[PDB]
Structure formats: C-alpha cells, structure tokens
Amino acid sequence: AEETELFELAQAAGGAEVFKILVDLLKLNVAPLAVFQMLKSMCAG
Amino acid sequence: MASVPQLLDDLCEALLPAQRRGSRKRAKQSLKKVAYNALFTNLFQDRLPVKNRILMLSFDLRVGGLAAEADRLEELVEGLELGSVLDLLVQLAGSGPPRVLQNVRYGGYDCCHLSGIEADVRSIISGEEELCRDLIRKTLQVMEAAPGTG
Amino acid sequence: SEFRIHHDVNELLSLLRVHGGDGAEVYIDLLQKNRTPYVTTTVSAHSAKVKIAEFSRTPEDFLKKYDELKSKNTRNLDPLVYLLSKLMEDRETLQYLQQNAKERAELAASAAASSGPTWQQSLELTRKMLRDKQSKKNSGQRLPVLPAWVYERPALLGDFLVPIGSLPLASQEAAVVEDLLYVLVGVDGRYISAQPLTGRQGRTFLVDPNLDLSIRELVSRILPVAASYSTVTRFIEEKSSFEYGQVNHALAAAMRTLVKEYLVLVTQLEQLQRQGLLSLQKLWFYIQPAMRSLDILASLATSVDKGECIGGATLSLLHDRSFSYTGDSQAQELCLHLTKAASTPYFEILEKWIYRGIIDDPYSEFMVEEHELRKEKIQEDYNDKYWDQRYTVVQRQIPSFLQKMAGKVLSTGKYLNVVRECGHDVTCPVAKEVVYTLKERAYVEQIEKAFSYASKVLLDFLMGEKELLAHLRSIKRYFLMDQGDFFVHFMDLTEEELKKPVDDITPTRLEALLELALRMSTANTDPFKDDLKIDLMPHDLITQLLRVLAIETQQEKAMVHADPTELTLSGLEAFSFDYVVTWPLSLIINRKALTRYQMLFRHMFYCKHVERQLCSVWISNKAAKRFSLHSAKWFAGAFTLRQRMLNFVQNIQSYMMFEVMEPTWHVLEQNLRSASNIDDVLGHHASFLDNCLKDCMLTNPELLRVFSKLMSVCVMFTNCLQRFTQSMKLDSPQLASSFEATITKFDKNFSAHLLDLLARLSIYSTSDCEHGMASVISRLDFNGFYTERLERLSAER
Amino acid sequence: NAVRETMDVLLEISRILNTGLDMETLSICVRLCEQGINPEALSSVIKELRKATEALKAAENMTS
C-alpha cells in the first residue's frame, strides 16, 4: 500500500486527492507517454 | 561407449577440477586438447600373465608388510576369475597416496611382538596428534606476520 | 483486477471532477496497453532529477526527497519523479488539475467543519515484527529463527561497548595508536573515549583534549573506518537474524569471512605494534589500503538494512551496486563474488523451483510460491484458480537479473509446478547451477532450454496421462451425437421424463433411463463414459442465455434477475448434462467453461426434439396419401405449414450441421494438432467453443429471441397438430381449441414469424454481412415461391 | 547390476592398489576396453592426463 510513502512523495512534490490511483497505475507499470497524455486530458477534464 | 573425443572430454573434465569462467572453459578445452594430443601420440607410436601380475602385486604387498591387504586383493582377484582395465589400473596402482598408517595361546605363545606393535601404534597416534598440532601452529605462525588482505 | 480501471481510472474521471472530455477512461485505456509486469524505465534519471530541481520553486524538499525516497528504496520512484517533473512543465495541465482538485478540496473542507535512534529498539522492533511476518508467511509452521538467547547476552559478539597531559609527541602518537587499535578491536581508547553507536552507527568518538590538533585531524580519517567497522559488525549480526533470512545469513557469513581479513590486517599491524616499529603516517599508509574498503563493505550492508531488503530487494541492490562499483574495481569484483555465492542461497531454490520443478519456500525467495489452490474444485466450479493459482507469483520478490527472465521464468515455473501437481514431480534435467554471474543473457540462456524442456514435458504428459484424444473422440458423441445411436437412445428414452414436468420429473427414473440408454447402443467404444453424466438447470437455456444476452440490456431485472421460480419447472428446458475430469486429469471444464461446452447440447437437442416431433407428425400423416388432402382443411393446411416450417427449422439445422459445424470442429482438430503448450491446446479448444457458438448464433439477444420465437412457434404448431390429431383421431376440448383448421391461421402466423426470422437473417447479412448470415439468406431464398414474396416483404421496410 | 558389482570389485582392487581411480573413470575405461582400447594406451594417457590435471590445479591455485 505505502499510503504514507505516497503522501511523503506528495509532500516532496510540495504542491499547493491522494492521487495514489496513479500509483496503482505505476503498480500496473503504465507507460510515461500514455501517462502524460492522460494527465493532460484529465487536466482538461 | 561414446565417441573417442566425447569420452575423452568426459574423462578429462572428470580429472579436471575446474580467474574467469572463460578461463574455466579454456582449462576444460586445454584438458581435452592435451588428452587428444596424448591419444594421438599413443596412436602414432602404436607382457606378463594377468594372473602372474596379480601374483606379483600381492607378493609385493605381503613383502611390504601388507600380507592381509594382499589377501584381500587376492580375494577380489579370485572373485574376478576387463583384463585391459586391470592392467590400466595396475599401472595407476600406487598413484593413490601410499598407505603408511591405517583356540587360544599355548602359554609360550605370549609375545612382546604384539605388545610392541600396540605400543608403536599408540606412539604413532601421539606423534600424529603432535604433528597435526605443530602443522596447524606453523600455518598460523606463517600467517601471523603477513598483511592479511590476501 | 483486470478491470482495475473501473476502480481507479473511471473514478479518476468522476472524482477528479473531470466529466467532460474523455475523463480518465481513455486514460485507463492508454495505460492498460502500457502496464507491464516488469519495469523498463531506462532513462537519464539524473537529467530528469535536474529538470525537477530546476522547476522546484522550493527545491530543498524536492532534492531531499530525491534522496529520502531511495532510503526505503521503494518501487519505481523514477516514474513518479518523472511524472512530478513533466507535470510541472505544463502549467495549463497543472492549472486544469488544480481546477479539478482544489474545488473538490474546498467542498471537502466545507463538509468537514459542518458536523532517538536506539540500535537496540530499532533492531528489536524489527526482529519481533519479522518473527511475526515469518510466522504469517509460514501459516502454521515453526521457524529456525534466532534464539531469545541469541538476542540476549548483550554485546554477544563482544561488541565495542590514560594520562596524556604532557605526553611527548612520539608517546602521544604511540598512545593514540594504542587507543585506535583498541577501537579497531572495538575497545576503549587510552586517553580519549568513544560513546557507543547513536543507534545506526559505530562508536561516536570523543577525542581526548590532549590529543593534538594535528593528531586529532589524523585520527579523523581513522574514526570513519572505525565507525564503519562497528556498524558493520552490528549489520552482520542483523543479517544473521533468521528474520533477515538464510540468504541474509549467507551474506553475513561471507562478510564474516572478509571480516577475518579485517582482523588479519589488525594483527598484521599488531606485528609491528608489538615490535614498536610502527608510526602514525605508516599506519595511515596501511589503512588507506583497506580503510576505504571498510566503508565500502559497510555500504552494501547499510543498503540492505535501510531498504529492509527481504527477498530480491537486497539482490537487486547488490546487482546494481556491482554494476556501479566500477572505479572501485576491488568492490566491483568483491560484490560480484558475493552475488555469485549468495545467488545459490536462492538460486538453489530457484534451481529447485526451475530444475526440481518444486520451489522450496521456507522463506519463499523464489517469486514463484506454490499458492494454495485445490485443483479438484476447478472442474465443478464456474470460477477456478488452481489452474492459475497453484503457484502464485510474488512480483515484489525478484533479483535484479532474475526480474528479466521472471516472466519467462514465471511460465517455466508454472510448467514445473504443473509437473509437480501432475503427481510426477520431477527435476528439469537442465539444472544449470543457478548462481550470479556477469552474463545476464546467460541467465536466460539455459533458462530458455529449461522452459522449452518444461513445455515439452507438459505436452508429453498431456499426450500421456491426460490423453485428451479419447476425451474428445468420446465427447463427439456428447452434445453432438456424431452417431445416430449416440443420442438416439437419449431421445427415445427422455420422452417420458420430459413429459413429466421439471417439477414432475423423477430423478431415479431418469438415472435408470440413462443407465439403460448407456447400455442401449453399440457405440460404447469410447471409454470416457464414466466421466460424463446428465443434469438439469432450474431455468431454461433461454432463461439464463437471454438474460446474459440482454446483459442489463433491457431485462436486467425484468427477466435476467427475474427468478425462474416466477415460471414453473418445465422438464425440457430445465434439463442439462453432466461431465467432469479430475484436477490433474483435465479439470479444464470449469462450470463456466463446462457450461459453455454443455449448452451446445441443449440447443442442439432442442432442435433435434423439434425435428423428431415434426417427423412423428409426418409419419402419423401417412394416411392422408390414400385420399385427397383437399378434404382435410384441419389436416391439410398442416401440409402447407410443414412445407413452410421445414425451411424454418429442418433447413435451419443444416446450416449448423455443415457451415457452422465443420469450421469450429475442424479448427479445434487442427489447432490441437498444432497445440504444444497448455495455452496452445486451450486456444484450439477455445476456437472450437467460441467459433462454434458464433456459427450457432446464440449470443445476439434480439436475433436469438427471434430464432427462439420461430422455434417456439414451430413447437406450438407441432403441439397444436398433435392436439388436433388426438382430438380428431379420438373424434373418429383444449386440443380442439388449439385449432379447428385454425391451424391454417397458426401456419400463417408461423409463416409470418418465418418472414420475421428471414428479416433477421437479412439484417445479419446486411448490418454484419458475414458468410453465415449470407448463408442464412441463401438458405431462405432457395426458390422465389417462398422467397420472392419474402424479398418483397424485405423491401417492405 | 552385474556391471555395477564388477565395477565396485574392480574399484576395491584398485583402491587396494592405491591408484586413486574414480568410479566414473572405471566406467569410461570399461567402455573403452569393450571398444577395443589398449590397456597400456589407456593407462599411459591416464597418467599423462593426471599429471596435466595436477599441474593445472597447481597453476590455478597460484592463479587464484
């Protein structure tokens, strides 16, 4: 799980929504290019 | 039964106890090549009764204070009674390390021979123990002045 | 699971406040074909880190975490770091995510307010937790764990737990050397002191004030290696824990072997020390030879401990370190040696798992662990795991080099565990000594031969013990007749049982009928008969088939969730079949797979019974040839209706018999002939099943309902004909009310339903073209006498 | 089993002869002799190969 380590990474990111569904995609080992396209699309909504 | 090179390689690797893994492969190949060269030399270059030879070997043992070992070997030979394998083994005989350490009395049959034999055995045991201790001590003493990292 | 996108990505679209656009559904689809069991993140991670720090407004925490996250050495921190850097690149994407998140954050906030390091303690918590973890993994087994007395006897390794006010400079150097030698032996200094390790440490020195500033500076180099050696002894003890692992014990013992070299050098210097011929600069010269090596050795130990490296964690750390220990060529080779040795601690089990086909998992170091999976319950269960969970894969536990072949190794280990579950557990003759070596392709090289041998052995064992050839030459009689006498007895005997409703059927009578029909034919050459039986379902084939076809389509609760208990227990559709094959002996047919193989029997035998009823009606209709059928208004419209319905039912059967049947059956035969692995045979059978049901056309709820309506119209027409025959031959109530030459109207309704079915076939041949639909249209338009009119009604759209 | 017992008896005799011959070597030699290999040639090659193996072992021990 490492929910605490995911929050540690988020605080490391130091931004302004755990976002660990993406860490689940990392567990599935999704690709960075599709990840970037998905991030841009989810940002647009 | 295999190809002469195949069985030669098997036996050579059996004698070979095999730095790099490429070095190990090269050592095996060198053993095979040396075996092939030796076999080729034997082919390019290319007796006593086997019972007589076994008799000579047992006689040598009994003369060499191995009359019991001669009897054991003679029992093996009599059970045997392959001959080329026996000759090859006889040629290899002694190539193992030589072995240095391994109804009633008529009243006058008591002998200090047996007593002295037992005393010598006990003395040899003590000497072996002391020699082992001294040898371990020498190995450690030689290591005592060395750097230590190899 | 396989649909984990529904849990993550679909909720990413919804919860992320992104409902417009594609949301994270198309993102789920993008990551789905991009999600690998392994990691292929080769990238200039230094470049990505530089980019992140460059865009880091507060780069202190960014760089700190860039180091801290590696402290745990977690899973694929590089992908997250790259994501955190590349997302900072697009402020529009960042701002849009801020819109997607901050508004929901405000909503949640509003909804909320309405209503020191002790080595002893750090290691004791670890030891107790690891004992509990090993007990959990044991799941009812003991442990060769370290003893309580091993934890006791504090400083069990004899761990490192003089007036020099006016000493001469030489005497000061000598006394400092004595103190430092005691420290190197883990002993107290002469004029100075050394506080113990502040948890993860060696000895926190406390230099003597009288130690010269130059002397203290020179000693400063020594103190690093001293603390390193003390912490190294502590780490060796830590790896000596059985909780650390037997492989950790092997690593610790190898370290102890080199530690002898450390004490050896201590004594080598002690030679001159007792001689009094040493010097501070001479000592520094000798220390430089291995003072760095001390810290180098403690490095890998701290890497394992700090990552809590269990399983292939320390293995991967070690292999990476060995790939990076270059420059320090000594460490580049020493770590390789440790790798090669300690591989065998797991590689023996790996060889055991790979070679022996039996993975030893006292610690479950091999990723393949023989997960509990009862193979017997696979056949009778609609959902089964034994065929896939007789050996689970611990993806988290894998070595650096092992991770490459692991997937191929996963397949090979699955085959080997299959051989073990086959009773004939065996070692793969390829037992290439599993061990660590620089050749990585070599690790998979002999692995290729081993996997090939495993697959070949599986194929041979299937062709042997499984012997699926007879299991199919016999199943040909099952659900497909393939011989008239195969199902002739079943048709001839089940008549009374089906006449008895499903509530009215007698199971004992059915059993007797089955046994007698089993002995009633000469086709008993098939030996697998005992593996097969009959059965029944508390719902019609339609009752569940159409419910699935309308999979929450139009009758989620209207008919699919409507229980068959709403209707009555009817003998015919409720009927079913039974068959089974053991876990090792082909538990292939799980109740889902077994149901798929079974229901073809239901559909085929339904059409067979309808054709039998039609043939019985026609045979009883043998007297009408002795006179003119014109005077048979209630018995001659039957002839026209039979002509109009033979094309609907009997002719509909021929397309299944030849076009549908030959393709799937021959595909199964050829694909099984080319099948070499279990997956290949599964593909051949899956073709035989899916493609056969595809040509059966039993998966389009609208078209299947139309065909069922036509078949039911035919069945009702046959029933009305039989009723009119019973009410007329006995005439020589309800049956006479079925038709009074109104069976002419029933035949007209059958013709209209046939026109609708031909329209459905035309719809299949128009919206899907296909060849089977074009054949359905071709079989309908045999002649225009009943097809030119159908063509005009087709134009009647 | 007869071949195995014969090999065991021959190995016992060779050990009594203090030859230090291996059982695998015994089986290989049996195969060679049935193949028509001179006992003298086999023994000479065996001695030469034993010497070569000993030299290689010494060299590798100095090569560690």
Cα B19 to Cα B148: distance, rounded to the nearest angstrom = 21
CA-nearest residue of chain D to B50? D39
| Amino acid (1-letter code) at residue C228 | S
User: In residues, how long is chain D?
Assistant: 64
- Cα–Cα distance for residue pair C753/C783, rounded to 1 Å: 18
Q: How far does Cα B48 stand from its chain's mean position?
A: 23
> What is the Cα–Cα distance from C602 to C576, expressed in whole angstroms?
7
Q: Which of C490, C574, C573 is nearest to C529 (CA)?
A: C490
Q: Tell me the Ramachandran region of residue A31: left when phi exceeds 0, alpha when psi lies from -120 to 50, beta otherwise.
A: beta
Do C96 and A45 meet the contact criterion of CB atoms below 8 Å apart? yes
Q: What is the DSSP letter of C559?
A: I
Kindly determine whether residue D20 and residue B92, on different chains, have CB atoms separated by under 8 Å.
yes
Instruction: Please tell me whether residue C716 adopts helix, strand or coil conformation.
Output: helix
Determine how many CB atoms are found less than 10 A away from the CB of residue C647. Answer: 18
Q: Are C282 and C268 in contact (CB under 8 A)?
A: no
Q: Do C271 and B144 touch (CB under 8 A)?
A: yes
Answer whether C551 touches B (CB < 8 Å). Answer: no
Contact C90 A40 (CB under 8 A): yes
**Residue found under tokens 């009243």:** B107
Cα–Cα dist C697/C166, whole Å:
105
Residues of A with Cβ-Cβ distance to C99 under 8 angstroms: 45
Q: Give the three-class secondary structure for C579.
A: strand
C217 contact A CB<8A: no
Candidates D46, C351, C326, C53; CA nearest to A12 is: C53
Place of tokens 């000693």: C219
Q: Does D51 touch chain B (CB under 8 A)?
A: no
Say if the Cβ atoms of C12 and A13 lie within 8 Å: no
Q: Which residues contact B98 (CB under 8 A, 6 or more apart)?
A: D18
* Residue partners of C182: CB distance under 8 A and separation at least 6: C188, C189, C190
The token duo for A23 is 């860490």
Name which of C271, C289, C439 is nearest B149 (Cβ-Cβ). Answer: C289
Closest residue, chain D, to B8 (C-alpha) = D28
Chain B, window 119-138: residues with a beta carbon less than 8 angstroms from a chain D beta carbon: none
Q: How far from C601 is each of B22, B68, C672, CA to CA, in Å?
A: 64, 84, 22
Write the residues followed by a gap in chain B (C–N more than 2.5 A). 18, 46, 81, 102
DSSP string, C492-552: HHHHHHHHS-TTT--HHHHHHHHHHHHHS-S-TT-SGGGGEEEEE-SS-HHHHHHHHHTSS
C-alpha C142/C-alpha C139 separation (Å) is 9
Q: At what angle do helices C661-674 and C678-696 cross, to 10 degrees?
A: 180
Chain C residues with CB-CB distance to B143 below 8 A: 264
Say yes or no: A10 contacts chain C, CB-CB below 8 A: no
DSSP SS3 for C183:
helix
Candidates C259, C271, C292: best to mutate against B (most CBs of B within 10 A) is C271
User: Which residues on neighbouring strands pair with residue C206, listed in sequence order?
Assistant: C193
Residues C559-589: b if buried by 16+ CB within 10 A, e if exposed: bbeeebeeeebbbbbbbbbebbbebbbbbbb
Is the CB of residue C727 less than 8 Å from the CB of residue C740? no
> What is the spatial distance between Cα C45 and Cα C51, in angstroms, rounded to a whole number?
10
CB-based contact B12:D22 (threshold 8 Å): no
Which of C31, C63, C91 to probe by mutation at the A interface, max A CB count within 10 Å? C31
Per the CB < 8 A criterion, the answer to whether C254 and C342 are in contact is yes
Measure the CA–CA gap between C178 and C317, rounded to whole angstroms: 37
Asked if residue B89 lies in contact with residue B95, where contact means CB atoms within 8 angstroms, the answer is no
Distance CA C242, CA B54 (A): 58
Q: Where are the alpha helices (DSSP H) in C73-118?
A: 77-89, 91-114
Q: With an 8 Å Cβ cutoff, are C95 and A43 in contact?
A: yes
Residue of B nearest to C438 (CA): B21
Cβ neighbours for C358, distance < 8 A, ≥ 6 positions apart: C352, C370, C416, C417, C420, C425
Interatomic CA distance for residues C596 and B28, integer angstroms? 59
Q: Which two tokens stand for residue B107?
A: 């009243």
Asked whether D16 and B91 are in contact (CB, 8 A), the reply is no
Q: Tell me the nearest-neighbour CA distance from C62 into chain A, angstroms.
A: 5
Q: How far apart are CA D12 and CA D23, in angstroms?
A: 10
- The reply to whether residue B143 touches residue C263, judged by beta carbons under 8 angstroms, is no
Q: Hey, are the CB atoms on D21 and B99 less than 8 Å from each other? A: no
> What one-character-per-residue DSSP string does C51-72 give?
HHHHH-SSHHHHHHHHHHHHHH
**Hey, are the CB atoms on C265 and B148 less than 8 Å from each other?**
yes
Longest dimension (CA), chain A: 29
Tokens representing residue C246 in the block? 């037997």
CA atoms within 13 Å, Cβ hemisphere of C374:
6
**H-assigned helices in C307-354:** 312-324, 329-354
The CA distance from C600 to C579, in Å, is 14
Strand partners, C578: C533
Residues of B in contact with D29 (CB under 8 A): 85, 88-89
End-to-end, the C-alpha distance of chain D in Å comes to: 42
- Residue of C35, C69, C94 with shortest CB distance to A25: C35
Q: Which residues of B touch D64 (CB under 8 A)?
A: 19
Contact C400, C313 (CB under 8 A): no
D5, with CB counted inside 10 A (0-12, 13-18, 19+), is: exposed
Enter the tokens of residue C273: 């020390």
Does the beta carbon of D32 lie under 8 angstroms from any beta carbon of chain B?
yes
Chain B CA closest to residue C439: B21
For residue C368, what is the enclosing H or E element? strand C368-369
Q: How far is B17 from chain D (nearest CA, A)?
A: 7
Q: How far apart are CA C295 and CA C292, in angstroms?
A: 5
CA distance B72 to B66: 10
Q: Across the B/D interface, how many CB contacts are shorter than 8 Å?
A: 151
What subunits make at least 3 CB pairs under 8 angstroms with A? C
Chain A residues near residue C20 by CB distance under 8 angstroms:
44-45
Residue C312 and residue C306 in contact, taking contact as beta carbons nearer than 8 Å: no
Q: Among A21, A24, A27, A37, pick the best mutation site for testing chain C contact (most C Cβ within 10 A).
A: A21
What token pair was written down for C49?
């880190």
Helix (H, G, I), strand (E, B) or coil at C378: helix
Tracing tokens 């069985």 back to the chain, one arrives at: B7
What is the total residue count of chain B?
A: 150
Q: Which residues is C193 bridged to in the sheet?
A: C206
Neighbours of C649 (CB within 10 A): 24
Query: What residues in C contact A5, CB-CB < 8 Å?
Result: 69, 72, 74
Q: Which is it for the CA torsion B129, B134, B137, B139, positive or negative?
A: negative
- Beta-carbon neighbour count of residue D1 at 10 Å? 5
| A9: nearest CB among C31, C69, C90 | C69
∠ at Cα C787 (C781, C792), nearest 5°? 125
Whether C232 and C296 have beta carbons less than 8 Å apart is answered as: no
Is D16 touching B (CB cutoff 8 A)?
Answer: yes
Residues from chain C contacting residue B150 (CB–CB below 8 Å): 261
Evaluate whether C52 touches C66 at the Cβ level (below 8 Å).
Answer: yes
Residues paired with C576 in a beta bridge = C535
CB B82 within 8 A of CB D33: yes
Please name the method used to determine this structure.
cryo-EM
B15 touches chain C (CB under 8 A): no
CA distance A18 to chain C (A): 10
- Distance from C-alpha of C28 to C-alpha of C34, rounded to nearest angstrom: 10
Do residues C695 and C660 lie in contact, with contact meaning Cβ atoms separated by under 8 Å? yes
Nearest residue to C466 (alpha-carbon basis) of C375, C601, C398, C554: C375
Closest CB from C261, C437, C439 relative to B148? C261
Q: Are C194 and C117 in contact (CB under 8 A)?
A: no
Identity of the amino acid at C306: K
3-class DSSP assignment, residue B97 = coil
Beta strands per DSSP E along C97-207: 193-195, 204-206
H-helix segments, B16-102: 21-45, 50-63, 67-80, 83-92
Torsion of CA B2, B3, B9, B14, to 10 degrees: 20
Q: Measured between beta carbons, which residues in chain B are less than 8 angstroms from residue D55?
A: none
Q: Within 13 Å, how many C-alpha atoms sit on residue D19's CB side?
A: 26
Q: Phi, psi at residue C369, to the nearest 5°?
A: -120, 135
Taking contacts as CB-CB distances below 8 angstroms, the residues of chain C near A36 are 83, 86-87
- Distance of residue D22 Cα from the nearest chain B Cα, in angstroms: 9
Q: Determine contact: B142 vs chain C, CB below 8 A.
A: no
Look up tokens 């350490």; give the residue: B101
Query: And the tokens for C67?
Result: 């180091």
**D and C in touch (3+ CB pairs within 8 angstroms):** no
For chain C, say whether A44 makes contact (Cβ under 8 Å).
yes
Report how far residue C640's alpha carbon sits from residue C625's, in angstroms, rounded to the nearest whole number.
14
Cβ–Cβ below 8 Å for D49 and B14: no
Give the type of residue at C70: K
**Kind and range of the H or E run holding B122:** helix B112-144
Which of C760, C660, C655 is CA-nearest to residue C702?
C760
Q: C589 and C579 in contact (C-beta within 8 Å)?
A: yes
* Cβ atoms of residues C434 and C347 within 8 Å: yes
Q: Yes or no: say if D43 and D51 are a contact pair by the CB < 8 Å rule.
A: no
Check CB contact under 8 Å for C35 and A28: yes
Query: Is C263 an 8 Å CB contact of chain B?
Result: yes
